[PDB]
């Protein structure tokens, strides 16, 4: 049809336009920068509590607590500083792929193959946590719920539709459809006005939360994308894929900058997370170990080999004081 | 050094850690049963034998509690979430016999079987095949050969040898006959005996797992 060839000519126009601005590689301009060196992180803690594979974790806003979800059916709110277990929430369905901890500390969201990421209310008068609300309406499988605030929650899905829910009325408001894949990760910008989503189309997209329309579309991966984190500045974001490479896209440059690839690496990527400054680009590889990355020099600076199964989730504190690379052997390890 | 009131917080951790273990033990008591099948192949017929997204079927039989996971409704990329089930005791299949002329969809089922038996995650989990709908299969075989979808077959049109042959044809896709064991029961409308096979098979695979953990086998 005419619309088809119009779509390819638009794609050619976009490619030529973004080729017209790529006049300097990031490594080319940062070649004269002193390297970070080597980053010897050691496992400061180990909470040998879980029994099944761990699929997600979200650090607290106050940089101390962290919620961790596992296939045993209980996501437990850790106290990273003192190894304690603040809470233990038995799920309705043991299948969980994501969990989020609200930036106010009084709400926990979690979901999986049950098409519902329930909202738990922690700081309640009734003494025990409970399902505050059961947000339902997706038709695939949720993969990353993230809290905008105590009322708005963005959710990924397996039915190509990221949704922005509204807790107090239950029913959602917008529906960020438009790419026909399987969204496996989300990432809120630091100003929380924009968020990016990674599906199995090998195409991460930058959505406007307020408007509801795809602001920008990024390509450059061949296989699926299942790990994305914003740069702390808020104008770049690194994507993790099964390609054994991590790519760093820019929002204002609208295109790829770096490809954190390694010939020795053949395993996929499960989760990616920058550092507080952004220099370090941590990433959870599928070969049972993490791997740091100098995000302006494209060469590694250490390996966090401390797990026996694949590391399936990461998180970096808002203070930048720690990471914790949760893996499938039921052990999170708070590196530093 | 010690803390002060935070030792009671540590006690709270212990007070739920113990409970965590007593739920973990209970989790080992339950038997997991991933349920696959073609589009309305036999899934409804096998779930109706005994009491949105995944619809878990909890039921018990002779002091053993089963969980069944009807994962057909997950209309998405299977390989993205199939690794969540690495640990399920048994992949209870269900493929209809009567679905052997429309779109040779058993070969599509073979592809599905090829995806799940040769899968990297399920390199140790048994596959309890269920070639149900015997009656309609007998009707459609009394008036049509198996060559309508699989020309290479050159046997007879009687039920028994052809059914055993296609059972062996399914079993030949294993390629790892030692670590696992692909069961199979040709059952439709067999009342409690179907469930009895399920209990027997899961007790067998649990005993095999225990023998492998202790090292006897």
């Amino acid at each position, epitope marked *: 049809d005419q619309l088809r060839q119009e779509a390819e000519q638009l794609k050619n126009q976009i490619r030529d336009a973004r080729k017209a601005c790529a006049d300097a590689t990031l490594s080319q301009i940062t070649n004269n920068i002193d390297p970070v060196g080597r980053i010897q992180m050691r496992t400061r803690r180990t909470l040998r509590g879980h029994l099944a594979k761990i699929y997600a974790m979200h650090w607290g806003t106050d940089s*101390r*607590l962290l919620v961790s979800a596992s296939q045993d059916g209980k996501l437990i709110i850790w*106290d990273s500083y*003192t190894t*304690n277990k*603040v*809470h233990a929430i038995p799920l309705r369905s043991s299948w969980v792929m994501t969990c989020a901890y609200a930036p106010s*500390g009084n709400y926990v969201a979690c979901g999986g193959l049950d098409n519902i990421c329930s909202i738990y209310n922690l*700081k309640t*008068r*009734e*003494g*025990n946590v409970r399902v505050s609300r059961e947000l339902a309406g997706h038709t695939g499988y949720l993969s990353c719920c993230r809290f905008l605030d105590d009322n708005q929650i963005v959710t990924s899905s397996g039915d190509t539709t990221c949704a922005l829910w509204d807790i107090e009325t239950g029913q959602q408001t917008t529906t960020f459809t438009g790419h026909t894949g399987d969204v496996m990760s989300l990432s809120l910008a630091p100003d929380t006005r924009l968020f990016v989503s990674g599906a199995c189309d090998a195409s991460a997209k930058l959505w406007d939360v307020r408007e509801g329309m795809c602001r920008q579309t990024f390509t450059g991966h061949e296989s699926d994308i299942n790990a994305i984190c914003f740069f702390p500045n808020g104008n770049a974001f690194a994507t993790g894929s099964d390609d054994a490479t991590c790519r760093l896209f820019d929002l204002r440059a609208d295109q790829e900058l770096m490809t954190y690839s390694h010939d020795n690496i053949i395993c996929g990527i499960t989760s990616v997370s920058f550092s507080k400054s952004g220099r370090l680009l941590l990433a959870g590889y599928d070969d049972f170990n993490c791997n740091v990355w100098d995000a302006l020099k494209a060469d590694r600076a250490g390996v966090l080999a401390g797990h026996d199964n694949r590391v399936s989730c990461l998180g970096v504190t808002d203070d930048g004081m720690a990471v914790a690379t949760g893996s499938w052997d039921s052990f999170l390890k708070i590196w530093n | *050094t010690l*803390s*002060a*009131e*935070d030792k*009671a*917080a540590v*006690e*709270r951790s*212990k*007070m739920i850690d113990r409970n965590l273990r007593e739920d973990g033990e209970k989790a080992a008591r339950e038997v997991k049963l991933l349920l696959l099948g073609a589009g309305e192949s036999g899934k409804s017929t096998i779930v109706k034998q005994m009491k949105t997204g995944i619809v878990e079927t909890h039921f018990t039989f002779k002091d053993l509690h089963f969980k069944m996971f009807d994962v057909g409704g997950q209309r998405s990329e299977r390989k993205k979430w199939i690794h969540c089930f690495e640990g399920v005791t048994a992949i209870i299949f269900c493929v209809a016999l009567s679905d052997y002329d429309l779109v040779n969809r058993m070969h599509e089922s073979m592809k599905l079987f090829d995806s799940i038996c040769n899968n990297k995650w399920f390199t140790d989990t048994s596959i309890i095949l269920f070639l149900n709908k015997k009656d309609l299969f007998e009707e459609k075989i009394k008036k049509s050969p198996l060559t309508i979808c699989y020309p290479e077959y050159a046997g007879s049109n009687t039920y028994e040898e052809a059914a055993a042959y296609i059972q062996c044809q399914f079993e030949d896709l294993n390629k790892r006959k030692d670590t696992k064991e692909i069961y199979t029961h040709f059952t439709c409308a067999t009342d409690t005996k179907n469930v009895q096979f399920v209990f027997d098979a899961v007790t067998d695979v649990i005993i095999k797992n225990n023998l492998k953990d202790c090292g006897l086998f």
Partner: single-chain antibody
Amino acid sequence: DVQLVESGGGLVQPGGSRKLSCSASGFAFSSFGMHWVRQAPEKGLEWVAYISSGSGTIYYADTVKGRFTISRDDPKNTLFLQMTSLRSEDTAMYYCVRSIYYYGSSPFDFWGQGTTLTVSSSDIVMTQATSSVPVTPGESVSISCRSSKSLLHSNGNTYLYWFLQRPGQSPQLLIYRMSNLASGVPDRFSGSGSGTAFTLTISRLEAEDVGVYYCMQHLEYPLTFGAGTKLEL
């Protein structure tokens, strides 16, 4: 909502026995380290005995150790204190206090109505500043409370609390760990100070807030209250 009601009480014979019972409806009683507190009819509060969650730990005040005992009936949600050899100084009004201990938790959230018990005829001492402060609605109030030990633990949060016992009522928490606020009270209250020197600042006071404020610490058992400052008009 959360409800704590007691039983027993009245007048007894000195030296006898009395099982005081505290009911509990409306919360997860199984995971609440409960307390008991004495209130003599003419002076301030004093800690009786603490029971942990799941009965895994038991404490007592030094003056009552070896005379009482706490038993938890978790399936029926009832807390018993058995008193034996009651002397003339053991007459008071008794409150059963729920409390949950984790990171960011607020112990002493909700206090029972309390029951009276009338018999017939070292540790951190929390000193107050006065017994009455004449105030008017609208202005500010600055209660002060010194201590006798450095309440600033190594983890960096001083385990000092505050309360408010309005007349003919039961005291509820206002400030826990000297900076935080109890869920259900206005943000006009504000604690401050250093170790061994703590201050509460009631900003823009109005009526119905004229009860006694009991300075309390929680570093080490036996946790001890203060004499309280009964402000009036």
